[PDB]
Design a protein around this ligand. Structure first.
Ligand SMILES: NS(=O)(=O)c1ccc(Cl)s1
Ligand SMILES: NS(=O)(=O)c1ccc(Cl)s1
Length: 340
């Protein structure tokens, strides 16, 4: 690769490792913020729009219930998420601004991206044109080049985790399954439609699973639906492992060729995992019109700009029951979360 890229990634890794080895901790507290609205909710946490009471800045605050994290066996994953997020720095990764914990919860306070999830925009419009999908895909390629060079696997690529910012660029959110891995790792995690065969088959897997997931994402962006769709997970899994995929006739030949190489069931033959690494993807004909440096520098005009009224607008997110954020009078699970 150009010495320019090598030197960029060497500096990126140096800066990551310094923060990785000495993580920040306890940089705000709950009563510094006002609660505005619930933006999303899951089995062990939720994401809230909050406003800092002194600066007036808006943030997305992810709140995890320590007791539910323990019960759902997510301890290590939550520690991964925060340690990684506080150490990374890249244009297409959502920035962690503060983190802290209390008797009941863990808190990660991130930049708020008011444009909403790619998922919503994709479902609204149906499918993205190839140029539109390519613009987003290029950002993911560069982001994975960055993450993988730091020995990080992302493991949760899907449209819901890609927010569209005020310039129409992607910000990857939700590092709940991200992990620093030299070699292989084994945990069953992700989301069914996006899982690589080697995850389904319980193998020791590596960063090639992220490149598989990129194939799924590109297909879904360009078609409007993912390639292995079914009513129940086990039926999805049978399609994934089969080695068969069908493409809409509207897909270009170049798109089909790239997707066959990303959706390669043999991980040793999958683009992104060969001797030329990411360059097999960056040099593919489907990306011939992409100026990789201009994308990184955010100099390309985006396909669209989400409609929103300002940094506190929640119109691109959906409505959830507003539940209490309670803090116990007694510390819970202190030992498990000492390093957070
Ligand atoms: N006021 S409270 O319910 O303790 C709460 C404070 C800040 C939040 Cl964000 S939620
Ligand atoms: N050429 S590119 O940066 O991938 C791109 C820009 C605008 C698109 Cl639509 S596709």
């Amino acid at each position: 690769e150009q010495e320019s890229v090598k030197e960029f990634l060497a500096k990126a890794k140096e800066e990551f490792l310094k923060k990785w080895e000495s993580p920040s901790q306890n940089t705000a507290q709950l009563d510094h913020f006002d609660r505005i609205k619930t933006l999303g909710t899951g089995s062990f946490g939720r994401v809230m729009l909050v406003k800092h009471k002194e600066t007036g800045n808006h943030y997305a605050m992810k709140i995890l219930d320590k007791q539910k994290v323990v019960k759902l066996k997510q301890i290590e994953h939550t520690l991964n998420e925060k340690r990684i997020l506080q150490a990374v720095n890249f244009p297409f990764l959502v920035k962690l601004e503060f983190s802290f914990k209390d008797n009941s919860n863990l808190y990660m306070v991130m930049e708020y991206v008011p444009g909403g999830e790619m998922f919503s925009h994709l479902r609204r419009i149906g499918r993205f044109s190839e140029p539109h999908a390519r613009f987003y895909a290029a950002q993911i390629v560069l982001t994975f080049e960055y993450l993988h060079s730091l020995d990080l696997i992302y493991r949760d690529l899907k449209p819901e985790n890609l927010l569209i910012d005020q310039q129409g660029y992607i910000q990857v959110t939700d590092f709940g399954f991200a992990k620093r891995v030299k070699g292989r790792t084994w945990t069953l995690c992700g989301t069914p439609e996006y899982l690589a065969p080697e995850i389904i088959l319980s193998k020791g897997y590596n960063k090639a699973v992220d490149w598989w997931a990129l194939g799924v994402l590109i297909y879904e962006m360009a078609a409007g639906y993912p390639p292995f769709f079914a009513d129940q997970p086990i039926q999805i899994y049978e399609k994934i492992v089969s080695g068969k995929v069908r493409f809409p006739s509207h897909f270009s030949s170049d798109l089909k060729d790239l997707l066959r190489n990303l959706l390669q069931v043999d991980l040793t033959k999958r683009f992104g995992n060969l001797k030329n690494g990411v360059n097999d993807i960056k040099n593919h004909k489907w990306f011939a019109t992409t100026d990789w440096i201009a994308i990184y520098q955010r100099k390309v005009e985006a396909p669209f700009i989400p409609k929103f009224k300002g940094p506190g607008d929640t119109s691109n997110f959906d409505d959830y029951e507003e539940e209490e954020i309670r803090v116990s009078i007694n510390e819970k699970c202190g030992k498990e979360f000492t390093e957070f």
